[PDB]
Amino acid sequence: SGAIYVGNYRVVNRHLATHNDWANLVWEDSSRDLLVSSTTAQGCDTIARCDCQTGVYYCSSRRKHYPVSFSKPSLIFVEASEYYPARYQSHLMLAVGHSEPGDCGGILRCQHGVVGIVSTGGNGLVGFADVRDLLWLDEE
Ligand SMILES: Cc1ccc(CC(=O)NC[C@@H]2CCCO2)cc1
Ligand SMILES: [Zn+2]
């Protein structure tokens, strides 16, 4: 579990979105596994606007932050997980690290703020769902 809290927006894994998230929907994309909902209180997070390929992500299934190199956001094939089938997922970055289903929503950060959240795992990779292209997270 986990969420990016930027202005009056909450960014979660679409597959973990709550009834409240859907009741206060701003934007969703199943192909990216992202959903954005509106918040009453403002958020403590800043979004990275950058082409960084090195950062630190939180792994809940290890209680640990791990420094990682990660690929640029691409359309990638992703093997069947407990929360999705084997399928293509867009705007996805892969690093070499540990990711179990429960790890989804853990933050990846670089020197520029929040890059994205955990979304995929298995075979010793961790996929992150980039949010740097979502320019509208920083307005309105
Ligand atoms: C490349 C790219 C893709 C998607 C977005 C999402 C966004 O923030 N757009 C607000 C939504 C979209 C439909 C109407 O309102 C930004 C940039
Ligand atoms: Zn950066």
Cβ contacts of 88 within 8 Å, gap of 6 or more: 31, 75, 76, 77, 78
63 and 94 both lie in a single domain = yes
Among candidates 11, 17, 2, which has minimal Cα distance to 130? 11
Catalytic residue selected from 15, 29, 65, 98: 15
32 and 66 both lie in a single domain = no
Q: Which ligand is nearest to the CA of 51?
A: 2
User: Which token pair is 75?
Assistant: 């359309």
96 and 32 both lie in a single domain = no
Cβ contacts of 42 within 8 Å, gap of 6 or more: 7, 8
104 and 40 both lie in a single domain = no
Contact 66, 56 (CB under 8 A): yes
Structure obtained using: X-ray
Cβ contacts of 111 within 8 Å, gap of 6 or more: 50, 52
Q: Is 112 labeled as ligand-binding?
A: yes
19 and 87 both lie in a single domain = no
Residue 48 zone, left/alpha/beta (φ > 0; ψ -120 to 50; rest): beta
d(CA 10, CA 39): 7
Distances (CA, A) of 82 to 21, 77, 101, 119, 122: 21, 16, 7, 12, 11
Contact 83, 118 (CB under 8 A): no
d(CA 134, CA 42): 18
Q: Tell me which residues have their CB closer than 6 angstroms to ligand 1.
A: 27, 133-134, 136
87 and 111 both lie in a single domain = yes
37 and 50 both lie in a single domain = no
95 and 83 both lie in a single domain = yes
Q: Which ligand is nearest to the CA of 114?
A: 2
d(CA 24, CA 37): 5
Catalytic residue selected from 45, 59, 104, 130: 104
**Annotated catalytic, 15?**
yes
Contact 118, 17 (CB under 8 A): no
38 and 50 both lie in a single domain = no
**Annotated catalytic, 104?**
yes
Cβ burial 77-88 (10 Å sphere, 16+ → b, else e): ebeebeebeeee
d(CA 129, CA 140): 22
Q: Which residue range forms the structural domain that includes residue 100?
A: 45-140
Q: Is 19 labeled as ligand-binding?
A: no
16 and 64 both lie in a single domain = no
